Amino acid sequence: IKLFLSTDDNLSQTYDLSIISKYLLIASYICSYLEPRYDASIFSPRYLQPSLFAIERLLAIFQAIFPMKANIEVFQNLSELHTLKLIATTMNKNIDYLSPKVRWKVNVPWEIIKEISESVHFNISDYF
Amino acid sequence: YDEIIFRKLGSMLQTTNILVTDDQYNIWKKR
């Protein structure tokens, strides 16, 4: 029966990530789907494609949500996420992160951000 | 000033406060 109950065209705790990476990916989703108007009020469009944002917003939200300052491990985890392509940029060839023209967006669906929030005991469900 | 710059610069020559200072035994010797 179970052969006929699932397609089994699938090729195969789904993501095992560092805590800093998990909170960075929470804050990036918040940046990508929360309108910029609310950054001064809440902290002090799911079906649509994610909006772009800036690193200045991501660092501030990450600092405001982690249970960290600016040691190199945060930026290392962010670059790891980009290399993992869990976060996307507005370019295709000759990546130039430090150039001011680049912008950032989330490349991860909500179903994974929810599990990450559960694993780090965070309440993204109450910010929307 | 030397200790602060030594610690900020990451030098291993900065005194490490695992042993209490000799000035502390300028006090403790009287005990």
């Binding site: 809440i42 902290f43 002090s44 405001a64 309440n123 109450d126 910010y127 | -």
Partner: protein, 92 residues
């Protein structure tokens, strides 16, 4: 019948918590802690003593009196401020 009275032995337990609560008010949150909160703590402290029909205020009654007023003040804050204050007042 019962009109429970205060003991000055508990003055430290009351004043120190108030100053600690005041310090966190400027630290986080927009609601400033007012003297009327302290006036509310004593009243509910007296009410807790009146429950036991004891003529004097005990330390146990003050702990529950502090718990109720602090919890209401924390729970009325916005979500961003709410989580910060719950960790700062885990003792209370």
């Amino acid at each position: 019948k019962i009109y429970p009275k205060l003991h000055q032995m508990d003055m430290d337990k009351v004043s120190r918590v108030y100053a600690d609560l005041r310090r966190e008010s400027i630290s986080t949150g927009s609601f400033p802690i007012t003297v009327r909160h302290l006036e509310s703590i004593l009243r509910i402290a007296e009410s807790f003593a009146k429950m036991r029909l004891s003529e004097f205020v005990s330390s146990y009654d003050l702990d529950r009196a502090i718990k109720v007023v602090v919890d209401s003040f924390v729970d009325a804050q916005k979500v961003s401020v709410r989580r910060q204050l719950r960790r700062s007042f885990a003792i209370y």
